[PDB]
Design a protein around this ligand. Structure first.
Ligand SMILES: Cc1ccc(-n2nc3c(c2NC(=O)c2ccc(C)c(C)c2)CSC3)c(C)c1
Ligand SMILES: Cc1ccc(-n2nc3c(c2NC(=O)c2ccc(C)c(C)c2)CSC3)c(C)c1
Lengths: 465, 468
């Protein structure tokens, strides 16, 4: 009896600009926010778990708690509907095809149980289906066309009001005394992860951290060092929904006017994100080659041993290996570093499928969703949307090689003259550095000049086809 | 003639035994001895005695025997030197401070008697002193720096040749027909133990068992069940020396190669061993809080009754009690189960000193040496190395049906999975049909976890504010 509401957290792990949760509370006697735990690496799971602990803490401020439940949503929700006597369920819209299919299945389960479902857009700046409509029923496959469509859209509506005590009103959350025992956020070890020797996260999760960084980021806006994680970086918080894209949009617009009509390059980060979400939303095989209508079909090498050396940073190229080590250790690498390793794996040196690189980035990268990961890997491998040197790229960006020394400590003894090509160092240099190439650090896995010359010919064959 | 003794302590094996190999060279006679030197529980003693009978049986294949002697080494060895007219003594090096002090005293006594002492490294992958020298004179206290040091060392030389007929050559072992009466391996009852109702060992000791399980482990390598002892587990055989760390290292590399550059993660089990041995070797108070230069001073509770409930698996938390029951009964628990009970006792629930948990583990755990035990307990209690699990939720997450609980806490077998991890929440009618009244046939929880852990988190946060 009564109006009992559940808001389902997946993305949008925040209380600000949360229109679905705002609407779910309206007219509700009770409210319960739930997160349901279904390649994913340990840095992704730690960021998520920290996101849920920050949500729980913020909900405690409102005399509520987060409910964490393990299971598959299709089995879990029929039980919750009855146990809690639910009449309304709310979600932030998910544009990605697998999320679409999951949410369509839950909507059917909810309707059959008599539960009304509130769906609101708030993970993207725009209604992706409306952009596709203005473009004639197909997503744009060029960024400039996307810019044209966006510039004709209506102005962005204001972000939804933050969930506070005034919004909650008389709505309450029923809680047992053993809430943590049944619904608490688990630790990594409670999920069976090996955390031995794990250091403190370079990217701590949560809306609180995201809003702290947003304020520091904007105050700052008002190279070798670029390779390292910035304390005001926002990319993972946008992927998990800790930071609203619309709030970030409006704060940037507000800053720009304080210091007219801003160029759309002002929103370059947000717009590239929307582009890939829009391209992917109606393409269930967007993350594949075969069966993907927009993906060029290319005969990639099948080489699991070469793939493993790339994935684990054992290529013998310190520039490539340091990037993949920072990626694995911390979960974020510079955009141009993503270019560098993606080129090395696919069209550049190894000629391995972009699907394999995408799968590694899905496990390790914090800030790249399914759509953005698939679209970027297709783009950089010349597979859709119409060769870096693994020595010179790093040497030009960081001549002293401090980046290599930070993430490949075994190379720390090498001078800047050989830090990016240690195989060229004389034996005496290697001995004083206590690192014999081919013993303490591997030899380069390919001759870059020979491999790149071959692959360049292969793709020219593809594109003359 | 040249009469030699090889002193077994660790390294209870004939393969990759450089000290024994060097001792045999140029010797006319050889005698292998183990000295039973007066907390160690019955499962540790049984594993040891099975290692010694495997050693004795493998020495019989070479027309030799193991000589087992009860006494203190500083008293026994002056007698043996004269009785057997010994001029050669060999040992595998012991990095741990108490073993270091003992061996220095025996080396002095041997020199006084005119006996040369042969010492060879073979219990650890590396020369721990060479690691510390490379680091500038102090051990690394982060595992990342230790990995950096290890990746700069020379490649490991191959393990020593197995003691065979060929290696023994002309050397021989004088034997009497009364050998078992004088020097035999004793039984547990013969050491005064109560073995009534003891079931057959889940972890049988010895080099033969170790090498069998190594072969199966390599083949297999080529969840709720994780909690149970694996038939291919190697951890206790590495602690006792039935299996060489260096042999394991080389079989792992060979399996990997059949790339030439495996990540260090491949050898993860071995390097964490080496890390704690290195940290402990020059620290004679490594197992203490006061007077230990690397350990944060924390005002732990003194509560012997709560410690006893934890040690004996009477906490009232079935996940905790099942783990401690498996540990007592078999001598091995999963690594994550060790985290669970360590957090419950120290930083999590009871606020009892990590020194007390280490002493219980020292008595019951088969696979954790002094250095690894002390280092792990300091680590998990946030007391060193620059460092809260739910006692209901963790088990429920790991084994939802509760089969682990039903296996080790049979009084709870009747409870459904819904309450098997928190049986105090079960309605009385469930408790009645399960024939286990909570507070009568199985104790109530000894603490309110939510209240205890919240207060102890605040205690620890104050500790690190004082430090900062
Ligand atoms: C309370 C307690 C006592 C002992 C052991 N324990 N027992 C054995 C070993 C270890 N420790 C570890 O592996 C280890 C590795 C990394 C880190 C960061 C820690 C904290 C422990 C390796 S050999 C057999 C454990 C796991 C917990
Ligand atoms: C291999 C790889 C995977 C993923 C990402 N990656 N990660 C994140 C984002 C993106 N892609 C882009 O920005 C982007 C924009 C324009 C073009 C033409 C391309 C090719 C990528 C935006 S949000 C966080 C990148 C940079 C490379």
């Amino acid at each position: 009896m009564g109006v009992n509401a559940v808001h389902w957290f997946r993305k949008g792990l925040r209380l600000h600009d949360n229109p679905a949760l705002k609407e779910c509370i309206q007219g509700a006697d009770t409210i319960r926010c739930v997160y349901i735990l279904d390649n994913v690496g340990i840095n992704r799971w730690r960021f998520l778990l920290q996101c849920l602990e920050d949500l729980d803490a913020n909900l405690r401020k409102l005399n509520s708690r987060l409910f964490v439940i393990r299971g598959q949503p299709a089995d879990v929700f029929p039980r919750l509907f009855k146990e809690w006597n639910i009449t309304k369920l709310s979600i932030e819209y998910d544009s990605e095809p697998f999320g679409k299919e999951r949410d369509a299945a839950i909507k059917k389960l909810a309707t059959e149980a008599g539960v009304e479902v509130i769906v609101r857009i708030s993970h993207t700046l725009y209604d992706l289906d409306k952009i596709i409509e203005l473009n004639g029923g197909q997503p744009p496959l060029t960024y400039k066309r996307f810019q044209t469509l966006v510039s004709k859209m209506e102005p962005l509506e204001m972000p939804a009001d933050t969930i506070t005590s005034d919004v909650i009103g008389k709505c309450m959350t029923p809680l047992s005394d053993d809430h943590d025992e049944k619904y608490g956020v688990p630790s990594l070890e409670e999920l069976g992860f090996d955390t031995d020797g794990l250091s403190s996260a370079v990217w701590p999760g949560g809306e609180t951290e995201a809003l702290t960084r947003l304020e520091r980021h904007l105050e700052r806006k008002a190279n070798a060092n670029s390779l390292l994680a910035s304390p005001t970086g926002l990319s993972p918080y946008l992927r998990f929904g800790c930071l609203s894209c619309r709030l970030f949009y409006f704060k940037l617009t507000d800053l720009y006017k304080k210091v007219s009509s801003p160029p759309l390059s002002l929103y370059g980060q947000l717009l590239w994100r929307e582009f890939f979400y829009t391209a992917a939303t109606n393409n269930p095989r967007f993350d594949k080659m075969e069966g993907n209508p927009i993906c060029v079909q290319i005969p990639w090498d099948k080489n699991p041993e070469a793939l493993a050396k790339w994935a684990e940073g054992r290529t013998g190229f310190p520039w490539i290996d340091a990037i993949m080590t920072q990626l694995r250790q911390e979960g974020w690498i510079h955009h141009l570093a993503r270019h560098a390793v993606a080129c090395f794996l696919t069209r550049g040196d190894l000629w391995i499928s972009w699907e394999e690189g995408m799968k590694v980035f899905e496990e390790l990268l914090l800030d790249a969703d399914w759509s953005i990961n698939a679209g970027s890997w297709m783009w950089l491998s010349c597979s859709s949307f119409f060769c870096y040197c693994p020595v010179g790229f790093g040497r030009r960006t960081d001549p002293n090689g401090d980046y290599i020394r930070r993430y490949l400590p075994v190379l720390r003894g090498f001078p800047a003259k050989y830090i990016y090509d240690p195989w060229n160092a004389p034996e005496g240099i290697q001995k004083v550095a206590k690192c014999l190439i081919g013993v303490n650090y591997p030899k380069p896995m390919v001759n870059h000049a020979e491999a790149s010359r071959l692959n360049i010919e292969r793709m020219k064959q593809i594109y003359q086809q």
